[PDB]
């Protein structure tokens, strides 16, 4: 009963803590991409619009 | 400051283009003038020169 108890303990909490992390990926990969590209944003803006002013 | 330097990039050849025209004009006015101020009178220099 020990050896059975503690088994199920530990298989509820091995399976979830991955799954729940795999919540992270979603945000934190959106978050990373979009402020990314934000950032080649940023960059493109200035390039064509200081040299078509320039001009 | 990419920008910046793409804008002085255009700018360079027409610097450097707006600085060969004046120097031509200035030459032309020169060639131009050099008729009524006399056409063949050069060889004065020359000859004291040589």
């Known amino acids: ?55 | 400051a990419q920008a910046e330097q793409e804008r002085i990039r255009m700018l360079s050849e027409a610097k450097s283009q707006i600085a060969d025209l004046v120097t031509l004009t200035a030459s032309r006015v020169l060639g131009a003038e050099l008729q009524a101020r006399g056409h063949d009178a050069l060889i004065a220099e020359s000859l004291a020169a040589l």
């Open chain 1, 1 to 55: 009963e020990q050896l059975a108890n503690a088994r199920r303990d530990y298989e509820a909490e091995i399976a979830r803590a991955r799954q729940e992390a795999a919540k992270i990926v979603a945000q934190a990969q959106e978050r990373a991409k979009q402020q990314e590209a934000e950032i080649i944003a940023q960059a493109r803006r200035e390039a064509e619009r200081l040299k078509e002013e320039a001009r």
